[PDB]
Structures are given as C-alpha cells and as structure tokens.
Design a protein around this ligand. Structure first.
Ligand code: MG
Ligand code: MG
Ligand code: MG
Ligand code: MG
Ligand code: MG
Ligand code: MG
Ligand code: MG
Ligand code: MG
Ligand code: MG
Ligand code: MG
Ligand code: MG
Ligand code: MG
Ligand code: MG
Ligand code: MG
Ligand code: ZN
Lengths: 99, 152, 287, 108, 166, 148, 305
RNA sequence: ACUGAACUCCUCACACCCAAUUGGACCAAUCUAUCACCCUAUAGAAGAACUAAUGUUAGUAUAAGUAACAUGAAAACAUUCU
C-alpha cells in the first residue's frame, strides 16, 4: 500500500527538489525562483522545472544565460508598467503568435 | 552498613557460628591440617592462634584450662594442646597457622582453604616459593645491592 | 654499500642453509627423550636436522613453547630453533628455573646482538660503523655491552639523551617485528667468506675456530643481520619486553681506535619489573 | 506484574551477550614447575595438593591403626618414617608412624 | 534428529598439487544429549571460541561451570582424534574455529503449584559442537584506528553523487 | 517493491546503437509437445509463424524440440549471457507471437527497477557546477577579512 | 599478557632490599624539599585585597573536646597535614578559568600501586606519589613553585576555613534513612509496608519526576563544611584543630582552604599570604598556637569572677 | 508573482478505489472419466482454500536462566563432634 501511494509523493518530491535547486541557482544569479519562472514563461521558453534544474547543475553557463534572459524580460515588464501607454514593446517582450 | 564489623555471619546465629568454628578448630587440633571453606578457615585462624597462646599459658592456669575445655570438644586433645602444640611453639610468638587457598570444591565450587599448624608431622604442603635468586631480575637487583654496599 | 653488504651476507647465509639441509636428504628419524622433570618419559620421533626443540615444545603443549627459552640437549644448551642432529635427551630451560644461569646468558647475548644491529643500522650513511665484539660480561654487571668503532669523523661526538632514546625506539621496533633468532653451525671458511669486510669479525671467527676442535662457528641472524655468537640465543626478539640502550662509554686505550661500548639493559616478558625498579636498573646500567 | 509484550530475540541477544554477561578470560593461570599441570597463581596446584592429600590419608590411616580407638590422641610429637629409615636422636621419644613405601622425594 | 556434524569428518579432499598451499586440517567433534542448558553452554562456547586448544583447556580447567568439564573432555577427545586419525602433527597446533551449543531432545515434567495448578518443566538437554583447525589461532581483529576511520569517512564523502538529476 | 527488489541503471549491452544496432537475442529454444492441449498454441505457432519469424530474424537461432511436455516453454538466450525462460502453456498463437516478438526486441539486461529513465556518459558540456562557479574572484585572491 | 605486581618475580633476599631502598629514596626526596626558600623560590608578593591563597590536604585524625575561657565546650576535629606539597601550577590563560590553579598533593603512597603516567610526573617533580591531588583556585599573587611543602601553620588560630571531603559511604540505603521519610506505621494492619516510600508521583503525569527522592546509594560523595573556626595549631605534628565536624571517616583526606563565606572575605591580611615558610625562620613558631578564647592545657582552672 | 490534489491537460493504457447486500468473470489443490506423461488439458464431483472465534491438538518461544528448591562440621570416610 505504501509503495502504491508513494508514486504521488515521488512526483511531488521530485518537483519540490527541482524547485529548490532552481531557487538555489537563481539566487546564485541574483534572481528569485518566481521571477525566473514567470519571466521565462513570458519569454515563451517552455523549459520545465526538471530540465531547468538539470541545466543549473550541469550547464551553469546556459543557466546563467537563462537567468539573464529572465531578468531582461522582468526589467522590460517593469519599464512597460512604469511608462504605461502605447510605448514600443520590449524586444524580448514581443510574443510569437501561432495559428 | 558493616563498617568495622570483623566477624563473619556464619551458621544459624552467633552460637552456631561459635560452634562451627569450634568443630573446625577441634579438627585442626586433632589432625594438624584441615581443608574447609575459605571464609570459615579465615574466621577460625584467629581462634587457633588464641588456643596456641592459651596452651602456652600452661596447664595450671585455670582460665586456660577452661578455655581449652570449651573449645576442644574432644577432651583427649586438651593434653595435646598443652603438651605437644604449646611446647612446639614456645620459641615462636605468633604465626602458628599456615593457611593456603585450594582449588574450589568439586561439589558446589566453594572457595576452600587448607589450614595447618606449622611443624606438623604431615607431608609438607606445595608451598608457593618466590623466584630463585639466580633469575635475571634477581641477579640485576643483587648487582644493585652490591653497588650500593660498595658505595657505602 | 651497506645494503649490498647485507644483501650478499644474507645470500651467503641462505646458500649455507640450503647446503646444510640438502646434506641430509629424506627424513631420518631421531629419538629425543624428555629428561625434564615434568612430562617425563615422552620420546619424540623427530626428523633429523629439521625438527627443533621448538617442535618438541609444540608436540608437548603451547605452554612449553611460550615459557621455554633454551634446550639442554645431552647436557649442552641449544637454541629453541637449532635443528637437532641425533637421538638425545632434551630438557627445556625457562627463565624461572632453579638455576637459570644458561638462559640468562643466552638472553644477555641476544640483547647484545639486538643492540649491535640497532647500532649498525642507526647511524647515517656517511659515517662508517664497525662492530668489533660483544663482551661476555656477567649479568651482575647490570648492563649488556656491545663494542663498536665509529667513523673517525665522530671521534669527539657522544650520543645525547635523544640519540639514546632513538636507539631504544629502534630496539623496540625490532622487538615489535618479533623476528626469530636463526642459527647455524657453519665452518670458519664460510664465516670468513661472509665477514671478509670486517677485520674484527674475521679475528673473532679465528678465535672461535681455535677454541673449538673443528673450524665450526655459531652464526646467528635476527633479520638481514649476520653476526658471530658466543653461544646460544633466545627464540625470538618478542621475548624481550623492556629494552633500553642506557649509555655509551669510550674505552681508555683510545690511541689505536675509539672502542665505544654501548651499554644497555633489558628484561623479558616473563620477568617484567615495575617502573621504579626499572628506573633504578637503568641508573645502574648507565655506568 | 506481568510482561506487557514479548521481548524480541534481538533485545534478548543484546541482554544475554552483553560483555557483563560473558565469561571473563582468566590471565592468572600458570604451569606448576613441580608437575607441569596448570594452576592459578594464588591457588595451590591441584595435582600436587592431591599428592599431598593422598600421602596424608595414608599416614592418617596408619595413625588411626596405631591409636586403636577414639579419644586416644598421643601426648607426644609424631614422626613419619619410611622403609629403610631409622629414628634419629630427635625422633627418639616421638610416636613413629611407619609407612610401607619409599620416602617421597618431595617429602623430606 | 540430525547428525551432520559427525559426518563432516568423513569428507575426503583430492590430493593437493605440489604448488599448492598446505590445507589446514579440520576436525569436527561433538557431544550429544548433555544434561545442561544450551543457553548456559553458549557462554562457555563463546569463551573458548577462537582460542588455541591449550588456552581453551586452561580456561575451562579453572572455570567453575559444570559445562566446563564436559567441554574440556570434548576438546581432549578432539585433540586425540586429530592427532591419531586426521594427521595433525602437533597437539598444541590446533585452535577452536567453531564452538556452539545446540538444543537437545528434552523431556517434559510437571511442577506442582500452590492451588492445584502446575507448570510444565523441561529436563533440558543440549548438544555441543567444536571444529578444531590446525595452525596458530588467527590474530584478533585489531580495532580500527582513527586513520582508517577517517579514511572510511572520506571514502563515503567521495562516493557522493548528484542524486535525482542527469 | 523497490526496496525489496534489486535495481540497476539504464544501459546498453555494448553501446548497441552507436555504431550499429545488434539484435541482443541470439537463441530461442521452443520445447513443444506433439500431444497435449497445453501446447496446442505452441504447435500452431511452430506450424504457421516460427518460419516467418526465423527468416525475419536471421541473427537468432531457433531450436524447436518436440518432446513429451506438460508445460511448453520458450528459452531466450541473449548475447550478454542472460537466459530468460517463459511458459507458453495454454497460450494462443497470437499470445505466443507477441511473447516471441517481445523477447526478440528485448535486451538481455535484467527486468528490474531502473533508477533513472536516462543515462548520459557526458552529462555536462559547460562544466559540472561547483561552489566556485558563479563566484567572482578578488584581487590577489584575498579571502574575506584578510589584511594583506 | 598476564598482570604483574612488583613482588611477583622478586626473591626472598631482594624483597626486603627493594622495600628498604624505595623507602629510603622516598624519605630522601621528602627531606630534599624541606628548604624551599633556598631553592629559587618564586616571587613572594605581599597580601592584597581580593587575593586567594592555596590550601592544604590534611588527614582527619579524630575529634576531641576543647573548652573556651567562658566555660563552653566545643567539639574540635584534628586534621594532620601529612606530606602536603604543591605539585602543579597553571596560569589564568593556561587553565582558561577566571583564576589560576595550584595542584596540591597529600599522603605519600607506594610507587608500586600508581599508574605509569603518575609515576613519571612524580619522578619529574622529584617527590613520591601522593594519595590525593586537589586543585585550589588562586590569584597570580599566590603562585608557589611546585614541590614546595605546606604546613599546618599555613593556617592560624581564629581563622575560618572550609573543609571538603568524601562523606562516609553508607551504600544502597532505603528511603527512610537516605531522605528521612516518615515511613509507615509498624502496626494497625500495615502489610509489608513499614519503610517503603509512599506515592512516588501523581497519576496524571504518568511518570516519575527527575530528581525524585528514591532509595539508592548514600554517602561517598564530596561535601563541604563551611566556616569552621581554627581553634589551635600544633606545629610540631602539623595538626589543625578545626571547629565542629568534618565530612568523611577517620584517617580520610580532607581538602582545607580559607572560608568563602562573605563575612570572612578579607581576613587573610595577617595570615601567611603565599604560605607559611619555616625556612624563613623569622621566629620559630611555638609548639602550639592557641586562639585567644581557648582554655589552654596547663592553664589555671577557670573561675567565673 | 509563485507554491499547491489522485481536479484538469499532457505521452501511453484503461473493467482495475464505497460497509451490509447483490450480479458477473476467473481460479489453487484433491478425486473420477478421458487426455497428458518433468505437471498437463476438457469436463463431472466435493470434507474444495484460514493473519483472527479468551478456537482444538502438537512444537517452540516470552516472562527467564528469572521466582523457587537442596547437603550440620571434620576426617582414616573407621569414626568423632555440634
Ligand atoms: Mg548463611
Ligand atoms: Mg493438592
Ligand atoms: Mg518453559
Ligand atoms: Mg515509625
Ligand atoms: Mg494479606
Ligand atoms: Mg509487618
Ligand atoms: Mg502540482
Ligand atoms: Mg479441473
Ligand atoms: Mg473446509
Ligand atoms: Mg494455519
Ligand atoms: Mg486461532
Ligand atoms: Mg531461558
Ligand atoms: Mg525479572
Ligand atoms: Mg531467590
Ligand atoms: Zn603441581
């Protein structure tokens, strides 16, 4: 019974570990996990938490690039909010449209 | 708490202790060598020495005669106590008894000891002897002693 | 080189051992009867030139092996590891015997031999060390003495307390190694072949060959250390428990060469002395 | 009071194999120089003591035969003489216990 | 009942090649149906376990337990048979490789209690087994030093892997 | 359960796909019976499918032994030395065909828990993370609070 | 392998020789330290407020009466200073405590019954091993060179002192004797309960509070008696007559030091600050020093005028 | 903003989470009829399946090597003594 019930907990703990490791790497790069994840989503990069943790552990330069992209998009969003209006959209803020 | 208590609690009481010691000591006087439980022999050794002293006191001493009459349940041993043992130890002042531990009793594995009057006619016990003076350590200590004597 | 000398000496020793053991092939049976007080009448049917008094003790019991230091074979003292050569009478001698004199002398010689080995292997390479003799001083003297001639470079150097402690540490290292005292009765010719690079050992071998009727000499090895023995030695260095190179004294006739006498004192496991008694023995041995 | 639960074999092994339970090795054993049998250092040798006890039993049986009855303890010293032995001047005036064997070497 | 211990002495090994280490002799002996508790016998077996034959005999000669005499007799018989039949050169060159006590066939009796009630006694019997191996007793396992202990710790540290990742 | 069962890591016998794919299955021994309802499906498989399977998989030697048997069996021997014995007792032709195809497509590695769904011999290309990655270096390598 | 004692391998001739030699060495070592001030003594600073000097290790000889000039009896215990020497000194920094520490050893014992390390330490110090070593907290002003002997005159009459010792061990004692519990009545139905403890706790907590008074070992622990008056000093035999009782049995070693009570904080002005030095020989002390109120033996019978 | 279910989506597969009760599909072993012939098949039967009834019998544990029990002393083992 424990083995059957442990699959849900295995998935939950895997996601928790991935989130913890992503938080560690983002803090190393000066970002917070919510900011990194949300801004990557806004950049339209759909890397999941498992892959993000793998990149953090094994591809530190790629993860630094991703963190830089997330901070770039975060600052673009801040600029848009500050200068709210019809100002030109941020370069990375632009969203590719699929039909 | 038994601080300073010098007498073992033996037998069925004080009287029974005295009687057990008396029987052991009568056997010791008769045979000149008795094997018995270690504690009982240890307790009776002092009484054996005291009987030797009372025998030294002499036949004419009424107190010594009464002590011997009490302690020797077999009256034939009182002449022995006064005419064989005390004359034997007249030169000595103490240490009339030799007590040595014996391998534990086969029945109940009790700590046993053999107690004998020194100078008895019986075969000598396998007494423990100190290491010979000719051993390595003893010879080195003899060298020490000789060096000190030469210095002084 | 000292290493080459040790290697070649050990090689010659091993060749002599092989020749001696091959001289008597097969297994000739010799009867040795225990003439000792305890376990009387036991006759051992041993292999000639292979079996030893230690093998006799192993047949008897472990206590014999642990407590027996020497073996009187037909009335003569023998090393516990010296192979027997004929049917005979054997009696094991321990330290605590009524008259341990022979065992004391054997232990004393063995301690001197260990001191000599430590002396030879302690000094640095640049300094030459030549062991001259192990005087057969009595036990009453309070210290076993080993005579050595050091390099002329050190003609004014006296070992310090730290140097003596290092010598004791080396001796205790040997004791921990627990090496047997291998023995051989080897002809003076082979003895001279082994010790051709030491005039002192050569002349000592000559004296021994003159003393004995034949030219047979007692050659002993602890480990990689060949030496000439005045007599039988103890089974193993582990017999020693307390061992101290007490001091060193230069002999008065210094004009020919500096004969420096290393004086030490030791006691076996069977006769351990308390700390204070040992300290007094050290003080008396330092003389 | 009664046990509330059965104690497991693991707990029982712990308790009964704790070194406090285990038998202690004795290092006071030594070989008797006289006969070579094992003896504890403080205790007398069993073999030698049995020799002495058997000789004492023989001597005491001879003593009883000579006494001839209870309450006949002598008023003089006693000396044991073996075959081929005659009383000495000191032995004169002492009750002689004759043993029909050679004097033991240990006996003197 | 099982009697494999006795049969263990009947195994015959093939002749050893000249360039092969000499196989130490093994002698299996046992005593069956000893009027003694196996629990009590276990302490004696553990005591003499791993020791040389002479040391085991010395300890047993001066131990006060009843089983000590029985084990001493068994060990003496084992030594005698090892010398006579198993080609063991020296009596003293044997050590107790194995020593255990086994439960024997016990008998049930009745113990009368105070109020017409009773308990079931067990007349306990035990077996005793010994394996004697020729050669000096193996040296006791030395306690692990601080150096080896730290080496083990550092090996544990080095064995670490990045768990739950690529 | 995983704790009560051995486990291994995802792996291939000899890097089976790098240079060329090699069918790990090498031997298939079908113990069948002339008589017995248990091996009816095995008999039909031997009649109608075993030849086609043999010519489809030329790298596998198939030994069909028809002997009195109560439980017809198929023994698959793989290149790595693994031997897997399966019972084709009272199995239809389709079931036997699927089992044989699964054995053919399966490697010889033990069917136990696999710790990771992936196995990389070169997990890092940019350098595995260590604490000193993403840590700036200071002038003359001065540790904090160092005076000189 | 087998354990050994110093007499195991010594012959009949060598046993007495070794005894005599070692006793002579011990007494020679003890005498060699009788002149401390003539052997590079450490600086002798004057007494200052807040200074704590070293104490002694005495031996409880017994008790006796002692009457004061007001016709009042006082039970006074005898503490003999038997071979008391300073052994070790550790400074404030070395010991890490608030005060320096002096080790003091007392009642020389056999060298054959001491550990090898202790024997080495005492050999280096030049003194025979002592039965007990106790640590006294002192200020750096009172540091004394190791090996210096201490004497009963280190204290003086009228001083107040603290004495620490192991109490008489009474073994595993019942609750009634150990804690003075009232127990249960002897009669009126009491079944097998006359000296047992009552309820050990309450039902609610379902346990026994730590520190609950229960039957167990009594005595054989270190206890201190504070503020005992020093009625008298016998310099010839090095004896201190300490007011009242002291913990421990007769012939027990008691650690004696100046009282810590606040009332007696700074009364060490006139006492020998580092320690009394007989080698100084400024004025040979009388055989007996008495407190002012003590009815000295040899004095006229007191009359209450 | 993010975290967060077995909710939902995603890749593949799906009869595969309610007590009493009810319907159904299979089935271990045994015997019988035919098969089969290193363990079986199709059927017919039935003393046809036990982690549980202070269940019954037997074995062995736990409590536990615990509670309890026993032999007056010496000796020549004649005998004497308490
Ligand atoms: Mg009693
Ligand atoms: Mg009834
Ligand atoms: Mg039971
Ligand atoms: Mg009351
Ligand atoms: Mg009642
Ligand atoms: Mg009552
Ligand atoms: Mg989730
Ligand atoms: Mg069926
Ligand atoms: Mg049924
Ligand atoms: Mg069942
Ligand atoms: Mg049931
Ligand atoms: Mg039990
Ligand atoms: Mg209990
Ligand atoms: Mg009881
Ligand atoms: Zn003996």
């Amino acid at each position: 019974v424990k083995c059957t019930k442990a699959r849900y907990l295995k998935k939950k703990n895997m996601r928790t570990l991935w989130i913890n490791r992503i938080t560690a790497a983002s803090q190393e790069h000066g970002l917070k996990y919510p900011a990194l994840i949300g801004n990557l989503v806004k950049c339209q990069v759909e890397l999941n938490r498992k892959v993000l943790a793998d990149l953090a552990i094994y591809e530190p330069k790629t993860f630094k690039s991703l963190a830089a992209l997330a901070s770039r998009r975060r600052h673009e969003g801040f600029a848009a909010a500050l200068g709210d209006g019809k100002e030109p959209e941020g370069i990375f803020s632009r969203v590719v449209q699929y039909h | 708490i038994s601080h300073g208590r010098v007498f073992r609690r033996m037998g069925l009481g004080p009287e029974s202790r005295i009687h057990l010691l008396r029987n052991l000591l009568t056997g010791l006087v008769r045979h000149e060598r008795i094997e018995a439980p270690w504690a009982r022999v240890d307790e009776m050794r002092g009484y054996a020495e005291k009987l030797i002293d009372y025998g030294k006191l002499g036949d004419t001493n009424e107190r010594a005669m009464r002590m011997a009459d009490f302690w020797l349940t077999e009256k034939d041993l009182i002449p022995k106590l006064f005419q064989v043992l005390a004359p034997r130890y007249k030169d000595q002042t103490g240490g009339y008894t030799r007590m040595l531990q014996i391998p534990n009793r086969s029945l109940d594995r009790a700590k046993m000891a053999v107690i004998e009057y020194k100078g008895n006619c019986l075969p000598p016990l396998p007494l423990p002897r100190r290491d010979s003076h000719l051993t390595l350590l003893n010879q080195l200590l003899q060298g020490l002693r000789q060096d000190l004597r030469q210095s002084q | 080189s000292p290493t080459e000398l040790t290697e070649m000496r050990n090689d010659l020793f091993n060749k002599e051992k092989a020749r001696q053991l091959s001289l008597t092939p097969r297994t000739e049976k010799i009867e040795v009867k225990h003439v000792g007080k305890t376990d009387p009448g036991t006759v051992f049917v041993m292999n000639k030139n292979i079996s030893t008094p230690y093998s006799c003790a192993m047949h008897l019991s472990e206590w014999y092996c642990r407590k027996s230091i020497l073996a009187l074979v037909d009335g003569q003292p023998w090393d516990m590891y010296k192979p027997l050569t004929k049917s005979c009478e054997i009696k094991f001698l321990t330290f605590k015997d009524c008259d341990p004199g022979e065992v004391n002398k054997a232990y004393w010689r063995s301690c001197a031999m260990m001191m000599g080995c430590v002396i030879e292997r302690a000094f640095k390479d640049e300094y030459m060390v030549n062991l001259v003799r192990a005087p057969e001083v009595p036990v009453i003297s309070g210290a076993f003495c080993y005579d050595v001639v050091l390099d002329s470079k050190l003609d004014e150097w006296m070992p310090t307390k730290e140097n003596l402690r290092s010598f004791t540490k080396d001796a205790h290292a040997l004791i921990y190694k627990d090496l047997p005292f291998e023995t051989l009765e080897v002809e003076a010719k082979v003895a001279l072949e082994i010790f051709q690079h030491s005039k002192y050992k050569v002349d000592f071998i000559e004296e021994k060959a003159s003393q004995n009727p034949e030219r047979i000499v007692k050659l002993h090895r602890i480990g990689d250390f060949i030496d000439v023995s005045e007599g039988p030695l103890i089974p193993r260095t582990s017999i020693c428990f307390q061992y101290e190179v007490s001091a060193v004294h230069n002999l008065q006739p210094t004009q020919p060469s500096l004969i420096r006498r290393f004086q030490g004192v030791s006691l076996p496991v069977h006769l351990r002395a308390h700390f204070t008694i040992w300290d007094k023995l050290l003080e008396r041995s330092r003389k | 009071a009664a046990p509330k639960n059965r104690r497991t074999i693991e707990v029982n092994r712990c308790r009964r194999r704790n070194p406090q339970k285990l038998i202690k090795v004795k290092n006071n054993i030594d070989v008797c120089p006289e006969c070579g049998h094992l003896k504890q250092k403080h205790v007398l040798c069993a073999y030698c003591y049995e020799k002495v006890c058997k000789e004492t039993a023989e001597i005491r049986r001879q003593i009883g035969k000579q006494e001839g009855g209870p309450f006949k303890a002598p008023t003089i010293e006693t000396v044991v003489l073996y075959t081929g032995e005659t009383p000495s001047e000191q032995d004169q005036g002492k009750r002689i216990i004759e043993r029909d064997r050679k004097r033991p070497s240990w006996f003197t | 009942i099982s009697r494999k211990w006795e049969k263990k002495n009947k195994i015959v090994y093939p002749p050893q090649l000249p360039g092969e280490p000499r196989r130490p002799a093994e002698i299996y002996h046992c005593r069956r149906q000893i009027k003694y508790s196996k629990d009590k016998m276990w302490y004696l077996a553990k005591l003499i376990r791993g020791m040389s034959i002479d040391q085991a005999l010395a300890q047993l000669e001066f131990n006060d337990k009843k089983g000590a005499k029985i084990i001493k007799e068994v060990l003496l018989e084992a030594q005698d048979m090892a010398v006579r039949d198993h080609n063991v050169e020296f009596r003293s060159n044997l050590y107790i490789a194995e020593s255990t006590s086994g439960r024997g066939q016990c008998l049930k009796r009745i113990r009368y209690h105070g109020r017409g009630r009773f308990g079931i006694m067990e007349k306990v019997y035990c077996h005793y087994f010994v394996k004697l191996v020729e050669g000096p007793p193996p040296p006791p396992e030395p306690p692990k030093t601080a150096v080896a202990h730290a080496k083990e710790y550092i090996q544990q540290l080095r064995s670490r892997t990045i768990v739950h990742t690529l | 359960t995983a704790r009560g069962t051995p486990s291994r890591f995802l792996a291939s016998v000899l890097h089976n796909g790098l240079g060329r794919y090699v069918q790990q299955l090498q031997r298939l021994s079908f113990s069948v019976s002339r008589d017995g309802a248990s091996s009816r499906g095995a008999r039909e498989f031997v009649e109608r499918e075993v030849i086609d399977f043999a010519r489809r998989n030329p790298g596998v030697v198939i030994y069909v032994n028809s002997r009195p048997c109560c439980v017809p069996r198929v023994v698959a021997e793989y290149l790595n030395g693994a031997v897997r014995e399966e019972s084709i007792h009272c199995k239809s032709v389709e079931e036997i065909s699927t089992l044989v195809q699964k054995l053919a497509d399966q490697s010889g590695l033990d069917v136990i828990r696999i710790r990771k769904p992936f196995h990389t011999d070169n997990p890092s290309i940019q350098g595995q993370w260590h604490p000193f990655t993403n840590k700036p270096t200071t002038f003359r390598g001065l540790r904090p609070r160092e005076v000189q | 392998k087998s354990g050994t004692w110093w007499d195991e391998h010594l012959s009949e001739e060598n046993v007495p020789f070794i005894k005599q030699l070692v006793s002579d060495e011990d007494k020679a070592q003890l005498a060699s330290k009788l002149c401390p001030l003539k052997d590079e003594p450490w600086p002798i600073h004057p007494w200052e407020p807040g200074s704590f000097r070293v104490g002694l290790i005495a031996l409880k000889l017994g008790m006796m009466p002692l009457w004061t000039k007001d016709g009042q009896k006082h039970v006074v215990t005898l503490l003999q200073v038997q071979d008391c020497h300073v052994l070790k000194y550790t400074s404030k920094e070395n010991c890490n405590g608030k005060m320096a520490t002096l080790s003091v050893g007392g009642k020389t014992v056999s060298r054959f019954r001491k550990a090898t390390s202790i024997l080495e330490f005492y050999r280096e110090l030049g003194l025979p091993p002592k039965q007990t070593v106790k640590i006294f907290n002192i200020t750096d002003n009172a540091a004394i060179k190791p090996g210096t002997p201490l004497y009963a005159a280190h204290f003086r009459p009228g001083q107040y002192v603290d004495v620490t010792a192991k109490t008489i061990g009474k073994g595993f004692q019942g609750v009634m004797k150990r804690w003075g519990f009232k127990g249960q009545p002897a009669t009126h139905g009491q079944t097998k309960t006359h000296r047992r403890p009552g309820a050990v706790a309450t039902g609610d907590i379902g346990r026994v509070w730590p520190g609950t008074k229960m039957p167990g070992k009594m005595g054989n622990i270190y206890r201190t008696e504070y503020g005992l008056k020093v009625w008298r000093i016998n310099t010839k035999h090095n004896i201190i007559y300490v007011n009242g009782s002291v913990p421990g049995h007769k012939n027990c070693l008691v650690k004696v030091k100046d009282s810590k009570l606040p009332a007696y904080k700074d009364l060490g002005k006139n006492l020998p600050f580092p320690t009394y030095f007989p080698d100084g020989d400024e004025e040979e002390l009388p055989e007996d020093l008495y407190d002012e109120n003590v009815c000295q033996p040899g004095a006229p019978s007191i009359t209450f005028a």
